[PDB]
Every structure is written in structure tokens, then in C-alpha cells.
């Protein structure tokens, strides 16, 4: 009955039938995106209408379409033809990945380049990568992928150990034409293998690890109702899944006494970009928008009990559409469980004689995605004390190149002749805030140092200052770790028992933002990544920081265009967009498979409650 | 047989007998510090000599002494009389805490102040706090404590809820004189209780938490030999305990194949300071050096199975001396256990068809201390992949004051009439480095942004730069989060298989450092806390960043004095001192007992290994 329930296989099959009967899903059509639309603001009329948004690609070259369908009423609501030279191309299709390698295998320029290197074309894998927008006028309005080559010595070989540097090709995947093959010179193909399950490389496996057994004899403390509604230790929320964004959290609220208090209306990772910092023309165009260009949800892994998720695990298996509109289940794609989290609070008091210890726990909601060589885990945590935290875990195999003789300022050496170009992994969290309701405001809080003098005669005082962000034009903010800068989202019309506005404080990790020159193509296309914090006024159609159609978009879409409206955000329905990321200079220890590294952010209550919210936790 | 073994009760009893027979431990003497001395550099002669350092206080006013004893040979090695106006007073004695309240209870000025407030002297607890050095000439060379008052309504009441603001007294604890009583005016004593076990405040306890059972059916994966030598998943180390520093880690090494490779010779938290930022004369002198002034090891808690430490726990029970030289065991004072730590590495490869997941674990070594209202947990973590991490956990009850009518720029309001002054909690980690041996150097690594232009035509390149710190005068460094600043400790004479020097990278949290005016007393006494990183040349007697005798020292001791020697640190035996801390603006949620907040740092291998060190981890 909940409007926030997961899409069902029956809903997707109905969408397919509605599109087919409307003439919109002939044999030349492919579904490049399909997802359920959130309820519009103020759905208090109970008039449920399950609507789906669909991007439809045409493999014959006809214009793609954006279509909205009502499953409830069985109708097409709107259907718009897209001019992709203007508004951007549709996301990459999984079926286009194979096209790149197959087309190059018959191109005479590609074969000549491989022949010069004495490489068997049957052993050459081609990584199909998004194209971006650069100097090539012939690419405007065409669907282009760029290919980089790696050698697979045998079917179980890790091709990433054997990059073919000095060679790149561009492919038009609709007309099936190789537009350019660029060969800048022969580099030796690195020869050592990177097969991390080969006993020759691992040595004998350790026999020293004894088992750790995590069980819950009475079952977990959370309940799941309606397929995806979670109640756990006073928290309440709905777990959504979208093929572009992945796990989305809706209606995060906290039961404070007999009052269910909203905190966040919708939380998601709305974009993630991986820009490379190697100026070689072989790779200087390389920037992945895993969310916007590839759709991270559709590559979600099935998670294995005992390996990927350990403990008493509750799974969700979300349903997505394939390219023909058939439902496809991602079995065990989301893991849910609680974890012990050490000491929550502790005091031993000399005067009262009371010794007091309580333990903490967190609720974990997670999924993993794999796009090419990288694997990313997305973890949302809810804690007993009201803290909300996000953590991204990056692992997999680093993207490789040759290591040039005489070194490089932009590439790490991992093995003889084997390099790994510098890059970043940058995320955008979109937080549709609802602190005690929708009238919210953001303040920037800095530490204030004070000079020794009158009123501060011993020179020990320090303070803080808060600046309200009143309009979108002043709401583009940068981190300042040295002044302890944080941001508070408060509700000026809802006060705690001390007559102060209730709030939550955003704590960032203060990692570097986008490093590229501000005049670069990537700085224009990923403008969100150049600043740590943006605040916008809520609008139905302002969903992604990079715009709706990221693939081969020339730039400026998304947040820079939204904030030009200069809307009032002082005590209004607002959205916080937080940029955070990892700057990765690969180390030898990252090879041949990378140990996890992490980045994230958290929000902690700031006078939201009238006292500690965990006084009623028992001693266990 | 190990020279790094814990002090035994028999060793301490022998020290007591040696001091007594030498005439150094008469009835007027008190042991204010006793600890074992580490072996001198190059103990390859096997000639073991267990030596103890002792600070001896005299309650009759005679000069204290610093004494070194050889338990092995049964002799006094040296005994020096201390001039405390010059070099600082001895640490505070536990028995001096009670003296303050007892002396004030008979002082006519104190009783007059309490009478004006209608407070029963039998209900007034006095917090005995260190004095520092300020404007009072009569305090030079005397042992002073300052007292702040709190009301206990009944024996089990939390007195922290009832501060008596506007009143402070200074006490000479040797002559037993109250030197000054300052009364700046009557503030209402806040009336609400803060009794966090009272059902009236907690409400009914939750019944929703189901048990989490963590067991190890085959026992833990680590072994303990010789009382305190740990071997776990290729790590090797010795766990020491000192009454001043607490847990100390010695001889941290990693078994890489058949080679035991040193990483850190000694790791400790060598100082921690808690400066308050309230300019009221009632509290503007308030700065705790928990390590240097109070000795955090002697207030270590006994840790309870299932509450403080959960899982398959191995305990150490260190032995310390009481004030009379008798051995005292801190039962279950150190917890040791391993913990699951999520995914270690994961990749699903499209081309090879191989799906690979491995799980991570960490070894945990921890203790908890309680000094007055605050409780601190100190956690050392070793991870499978070679990462070393430290985390401090701060909890307990915040220090309180009145909340002034009309507000404050330096105090948070927690309850009606109840304030909590702003403060910091700042730690100093002393890391006696030994990356593959003792020839080490430190480099500062910054991200380098590059301008679009020739050689970088698409404006995507970025790089990094490393600056070697060659002399101590240039080795006082500050954080720069915006440029991704880290520090690498490397061994220039030990190279990995790529002919690069092996190293470890220090990742800081980049929190604000000491906020006080640089001309303040606390900035002079806690100079270490004004900068994020210091590097010194190793010397036997340079143990603490604040000097040997911190209590009532006028300033400048420790790191600022050491680095004036301007010694060569480029490929030498060096020590890294890292400052890190929390800036605490108390929130309503911190009351009446504070949920844990954390801060720390970590070190990760940086080309120390020839490839990932966790390829031999099994699938479990
Ligand atoms: Cu990376
Ligand atoms: Cu604090
Ligand atoms: Na355009
Ligand atoms: Na909102
Ligand atoms: Na002095
Ligand atoms: Na050293």
C-alpha cells in the first residue's frame, strides 16, 4: 500500500505492455533507463499513482524519447523526442560494450596496430569507455565510445596486467563505424601476470585465521514490513532502489517519545565521477560518471552470505528492467543487518559510586557494484544516538598503463613496466532535508579565535560563528578544515526545550575536491565536484547534480544552472548536495588487487533532542 | 627473558626495598611516579639490566628527588634533588585530591561563600584541579591545586548537574593552607538532576534490542607469550604499560616472507591536554594535562567482559606502584581481541569470469581511564593489510558551569540554567619510527594542481610533490587538508623491488590545533599542541612533548627546547610527534552523559611491500 514500495516485476511488465501497445517499443527500441517516480510534494490526497520514467534509445538512428507512464491508469502521460546534440545522449547500454571490441577486430587500422606489436587479435580485450566532449566536431550528436586495449593471455587471465599503451580508438556505436584510430608509438606490453588466485603469486594460503562467529540467537532487532519499510531502534525509513542511483533512502525519521520526527526526506548518491590525471592523449579524455553515464544500480552484485555480508543478514532483491522491458531480479542485491559498534557511553563516578557502561550498535544497509575494473561498496549506517553516516568502499583492480622509461609525474609504477595513472573518485550526496518538517535552513559554522586582551586577559577564550545561507547564489561553499568548518541544517520554526532551533550538523572529511583546471571539459561537466557544499531550493525536476543526460553533454547542466535561479533557501524546502572523494595516487600495495579504501560523511544531531536520546538503552 | 616484559609485583617490591634501605623512603615520602626504563639503543650485548625511574615527593616540604634504581643489581644508580620552581612540580598524588575538599570545609571564607548560597558544606563536592602558572607570584615553588564546587543532593546524585559558579579556591596542599578564595557573585545552582540511571529520567528501558553473539569457537588467532608478546597475522609486537602514558606498543614488526621487518620501535600517547575556552576568571586557568599532570595509567578501569569488551577477550593485568611502593594490580586493565572488519578486497571480472571476495580483520588493544568527570578509551588497531591506526574515544560527563542570563559566546546551554564551557581535547602521539631499521626520513607530500597549457592541453593533469625535512628547525609542520597533505616516513637505504625507498604514510584527521592566543600560558606550556607534526632526532631523555615535570611548569619545556638543537634528521634515528584532537562545543545531546566521540590517525604502507601483502588470505 505504501507509495514508496519497490518496483515489482508486475509493474515493469505492465510498463512494457503499455509502451508496446502505444507503438513506442518496436524491435529497434531499447530501454536505457527505467525507474519509478517519487510522489509529488504533498501527497496527502492518498490518490496513489505509480508513475515510471523511461529513456528509450533507437538503434537505427532515430531520435530517442523520454516517456512517463502511469501503471495505475495504464496510460502514457507524456512522450518527448530528444535532440541529443542539445541535451545530451542517453546512458550507455550494456549491449554496446561488446560492440566496441567486435567492430575494432575487423578495422584495418586496428589490426595494423596490433600486428606491429605482435598481438593476436583474439587475445585483445577492449575496455569500452565513455567519450566525454572534446575537440572532435564530428562527434556532436553521435553516440561515441572510446576503446583502450588489454591483452588476455588465456581465458582466466587478468587482462589489466597487460595494457597496450600508445593506442586508442573511437567508435560510433549506432552507425557501427570506427571514426579514429590513434597510435602514438609502441610501448612494451607489461609481461608479469596479475592473477591473484594463482598459487604462484599468493604462496601457500594462511592457516592461522581462526573463525569469528557472529550470530543473533533471537533474530535481528529490526523489522521489515511492506517489502522495504524498516523499523529499528526508534528509526523508521523506506529502502528504495533505482537503476541509476542504486540504494535510495526515503522518509528517514526518528520516534522521539510518541512523536515520529522527520529528518531526511530522500538520501542518495546522485552522481559519482572518476577523472584521470594523465595528460597522455591516450587517456587525457578519460572520466567515468559511473552513476550518470553507466547507471551503477544495474551492475549491482549478488551478495554472498558469509563472504560479502556476515552475520544475521536480511536481503532485498530489487527488480529492474532489461533493455527490452523484461523484469530482471537482482537476487540478494541489498544486505541489511545490525552490528555491534563498541562503547556507546561510559562513566565511573568517584562521588556517586556508580559505574555505568552501555554498548552502541548500528544498522547497515549496503550494496556493491562492479563497472569494469573497479568495485564500489555503498554503505548507509544508522546509529543508536541519532547519527547517520555514509561510507563508500573502493576496491577492485586499478586502471593501468605502461610505465614510461624515465618516469612520470602523473603515473605510479606498480610492477616492471606497469603504471597506474593518478585519478580521483568523487561522489555527490543529494540530501533532501526535512529536519522536523520541510522549513529548513543551512548555517555555516566556523571556529573563532580570540585575541588576548580586555575580556580575555589570559588569552584562553575561543568561540564560534554561524552564518545563515539565505539565497542559492551564496550557498556554494568550500571546506575549511583549519577553522573546523561544519554546516548545520536546522528548522527555525521547531525548537527544543531550551528554545533553540532543532538541527543536525554535517561533518565532512575535508578531502580535496576536483583537481582539474577550471577551464577543462571535466570541470564544466562535473562542476558539482569543484565545491564541497551546495544548497538548492527543492524542485521536482532537479534530480542530479550533472543533469538528466550526462553522456556526451557539453557542460554546465545540473547544479550551476539550478543555482542561477537564486531562490530563497532561508526556512524553506531545501536540498543539500555534498561533494566528497578520494584522491588516488596508486601504491605498490594496490596491485594486483586493491585493499579497500574509504571515504564518506556523517550527520549528528545538534540540539535536535532535549537530552541524550539513548538514556533508555539497557545494560544487556 | 624479554627486556620489554611488563613490570612484575616482585620487581616493584624490590624497588621499594632498595629505596627503603637507601634511606629514600621514610614515612614522609611518597612515590609520585614509578616506571621501567626502556633498554638503551643497541642492547645487542644481551646484558639485561631492569632499571626503574622513580619520582619521590616529600609531604613535609623537603625537596623531591628523581631516582633511578637497578633491580637487576639491587642498587641506586642516581638520586637527584629537584628544584621545583625551576624544573616543575611532581605529578599530582591521588591522596592530595581529598585534601582540597577537607581543607576548604574549615576555611571561614569558603564557609561564608557557601552560607550566602544556603548550601550545606556536607553536600558540597570540590573538584581538585591542576593549577597551571599564571599571575600569582606566591605560587612559585609551591604545590597548588584549585578547587571548583558542585552540590551532591544525596550520596548517589551526580554532582556535575549542580555547579556552584562564581566561586573558586586555591590550596597549598603541602603546607595545608587555603591561599585564596575568590567569590565573583552568586549564581543560581542549576536544579534539575542529571541521574542517568533514574527511571524518572530514562523512562522505561527498551525491550527491542536482541542479542548479538560474537564468539570464536576455535579460540583467537593471536598468541601471547612471555606475558606480553603478541603474534597475530604476521604482526609481532610487545604490549607495555606505564603509569604515566598507559598502554605503550614496542617493537611493532611485520613478518614479510621469512624476514621480520621493523616498522615502529615505540608508539605511545605521550601527552594529552584539555584546555578550556571560557574567559570567566572562575575557569580561565583550567587546563588538564591528563597524562603529564595526573598520570592516565594509574586511573585505568577494570574492563568487564560483555560490557566493555565483547567477544573472545584476552586480558592483561598490569602492575603499578602505589604511593608507598607497594605493588597494585589493575585487574583486567587491558583488553585484547580480534574483530571482523568487513570486506578486505573484492573484484568480479567480466573477462576472466573470476569472482573474488576476502574479508578484513583487525587486532584491538585497548584500555579506559577515568579522571574526574571524563572517561577516555585508547584503542590501537592492527589490520591485515599493514595499516596501523589509533583512536581515542571520549565519553563521561561534560564539565559544567552556570549558564549566564543573557547567554554566552563561550558556553553551551545544556539544561535550564546549566552551561558547559567550550574546550578542546588534544593528544600527542610519539612515534619512535623504525621503518625497516633506524635510518629514516620524513617527506611532506602535497597534491600539485597543474594549469591547462602545453603538455596539459586538456587541463586534466595533476601531480604531487614531496619535500624532505632535513633538519629539526624545518620539521615543525602544519596540516593542509585542501592540498591533501600527508607525511611519508621512509628508509632511504631499503628499497622495494621497484628500487623505490620503502615507506609508510601518515594520514591525519586535520582537526583544528590549539585555539588559545599564542601569548597565553597554555600556548607556552602546551606548545606541542600548536602544530600538527614535529620530527626530532632520537634521544634517550626526550620522552614527553611537554617535558618531564609538567605540573606548574612555567613553559617552554619539551618539543620547543628539543628542536632548537637543529639536529640532522635526513636518514637518521628519528621520532615523529603528531598532534590531533577534538574541539568540543557541547550539545544538548551530550547531557546528562555523553555519547562517545572519536579522533585519531592512521599509517598505511607506501611501497613498503613489493605487492599487496594480503594475497595469501583464504576465502573462509
Ligand atoms: Cu582509485
Ligand atoms: Cu569534551
Ligand atoms: Na549542447
Ligand atoms: Na527538503
Ligand atoms: Na621555571
Ligand atoms: Na627512530
From Swiss-Prot, chains A, B:
Disulfide bonds join 309-335. Gene3D superfamilies: 3.10.450.40, Copper amine oxidase, catalytic domain (2.70.98.20). Substrate binds at residues 288-299, 371-376. It holds the Pfam family Cu_amine_oxid. One of its GO terms (biological process) is amine metabolic process. Its EC number is 1.4.3.21. Topaquinone (TPQ) is generated by copper-dependent autoxidation of a specific tyrosyl residue. Binds 1 copper ion per subunit. Keywords: Copper, Disulfide bond, Metal-binding, Oxidoreductase, TPQ. The modification 2',4',5'-topaquinone is found at residue 374. The active site is at residues 290, 374. PROSITE patterns: COPPER_AMINE_OXID_1 (PS01164), COPPER_AMINE_OXID_2 (PS01165). PANTHER family: COPPER AMINE OXIDASE, COPPER AMINE OXIDASE 1-RELATED. This is Phenylethylamine oxidase. It comes from Arthrobacter globiformis. The lineage of its organism: Bacteria, Bacillati, Actinomycetota, Actinomycetes, Micrococcales.
Amino acid at each position: 500500500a505504501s507509495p514508496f514500495r519497490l518496483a515489482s516485476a508486475g509493474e515493469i511488465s505492465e510498463v512494457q505492455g503499455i509502451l508496446r501497445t502505444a507503438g513506442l517499443l518496436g524491435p529497434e527500441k531499447r530501454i536505457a533507463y527505467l525507474g519509478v517516480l517519487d510522489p509529488a510534494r504533498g501527497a496527502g490526497s492518498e490518490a496513489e499513482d505509480r508513475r515510471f520514467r523511461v529513456f528509450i534509445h533507437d538503434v537505427s538512428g532515430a531520435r530517442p524519447q523520454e516517456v512517463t507512464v502511469s501503471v495505475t491508469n495504464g496510460t502514457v502521460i507524456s512522450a518527448v523526442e530528444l535532440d541529443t546534440a542539445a541535451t545530451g545522449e542517453l546512458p550507455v547500454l550494456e549491449e554496446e560494450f561488446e560492440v566496441v571490441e567486435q567492430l575494432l577486430a575487423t578495422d584495418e587500422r586496428w589490426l595494423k596496430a596490433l600486428a606491429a606489436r605482435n598481438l593476436d587479435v583474439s587475445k585483445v580485450r577492449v575496455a569500452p569507455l565513455s567519450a566525454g566532449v572534446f575537440e572532435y566536431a564530428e562527434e556532436r550528436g553521435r553516440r561515441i565510445l572510446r576503446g583502450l586495449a588489454f591483452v588476455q593471455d588465456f581465458p582466466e587471465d587478468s587482462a589489466w596486467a597487460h595494457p597496450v599503451d600508445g593506442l586508442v580508438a573511437y567508435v560510433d556505436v549506432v552507425s557501427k563505424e570506427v571514426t579514429r584510430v590513434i597510435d602514438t608509438g609502441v610501448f612494451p606490453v607489461p609481461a608479469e601476470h596479475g592473477n591473484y588466485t594463482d598459487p604462484e603469486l599468493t604462496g601457500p594460503l594462511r592457516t592461522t585465521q581462526k573463525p569469528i562467529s557472529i550470530t543473533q540467537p533471537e533474530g535481528p532487532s529490526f523489522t521489515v514490513t511492506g517489502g522495504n519499510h524498516i523499523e529499528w531502534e526508534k528509526w523508521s525509513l523506506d529502502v528504495g532502489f533505482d537503476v541509476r542511483e542504486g540504494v535510495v533512502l526515503h522518509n528517514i525519521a526518528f520516534r522521539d517519545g510518541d512523536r515520529l520526527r522527520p529528518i531526511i526526506n530522500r538520501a542518495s548518491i546522485a552522481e559519482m565521477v572518476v577523472p584521470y590525471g594523465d595528460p597522455s592523449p591516450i587517456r587525457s579524455w578519460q572520466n567515468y560518471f559511473d552513476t550518470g553515464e553507466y547507471l551503477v544500480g544495474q551492475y549491482a552484485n549478488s551478495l554472498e552470505l558469509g563472504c560479502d555480508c556476515l552475520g544475521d543478514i536480511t536481503y532485498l532483491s530489487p527488480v529492474i528492467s532489461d533493455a527490452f522491458g523484461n523484469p530482471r531480479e537482482i537476487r540478494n542485491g541489498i544486505c541489511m543487518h545490525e552490528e555491534d559498534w563498541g562503547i556507546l557511553a561510559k562513566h565511573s563516578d568517584l562521588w556517586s559510586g556508580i559505574n555505568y557502561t552501555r554498548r552502541n550498535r548500528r544498522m547497515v544497509i549496503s550494496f556493491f557494484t562492479t563497472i569494469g575494473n573497479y568495485d564500489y561498496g555503498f554503505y548507509w549506517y544508522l546509529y543508536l544516538d541519532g547519527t547517520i553516516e555514509f561510507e563508500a568502499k573502493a576496491t577492485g583492480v586499478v586502471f593501468t598503463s605502461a610505465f614510461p622509461e624515465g618516469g612520470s609525474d602523473n603515473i605510479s609504477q606498480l610492477a616492471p613496466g606497469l603504471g597506474a595513472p593518478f585519478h580521483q573518485h568523487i561522489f555527490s550526496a543529494r540530501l533532501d532535508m526535512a529536519i522536523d518538517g520541510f522549513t529548513n535552513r543551512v548555517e555555516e559554522e566556523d571556529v573563532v579565535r580570540q585575541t588576548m586582551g580586555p575580556g580575555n586577559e589570559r588569552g584562553n577564550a575561543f568561540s564560534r560563528k554561524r552564518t545563515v545561507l539565505t539565497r542559492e547564489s551564496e550557498a556554494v561553499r568550500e571546506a575549511d578544515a583549519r577553522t573546523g568548518r561544519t554546516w548545520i541544517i536546522s528548522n527555525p520554526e521547531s525548537k527544543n526545550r531550551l528554545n533553540e532551533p532543532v538541527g543536525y550538523k554535517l561533518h565532512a572529511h575535508n578531502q580535496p575536491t576536483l583537481l582539474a583546471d577550471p577551464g577543462s571539459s571535466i570541470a564544466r561537466r562535473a562542476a558539482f565536484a569543484t565545491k564541497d557544499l551546495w544548497v538548492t531550493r527543492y524542485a521536482d525536476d532537479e534530480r542530479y547534480p550533472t543533469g538528466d543526460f550526462v553522456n556526451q553533454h557539453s557542460g554546465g547542466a545540473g547544479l550551476p544552472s539550478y543555482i542561477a535561479q537564486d531562490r530563497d533557501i532561508d526556512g524553506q524546502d531545501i536540498v543539500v548536495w555534498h561533494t566528497f572523494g578520494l584522491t588516488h595516487f596508486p601504491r605498490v600495495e594496490d596491485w594486483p588487487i586493491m585493499p579497500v579504501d574509504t571515504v564518506g560523511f556523517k550527520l549528528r544531531p545538534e540540539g535536535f533532542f532535549d537530552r541524550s536520546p539513548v538514556l533508555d538503552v539497557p545494560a544487556n
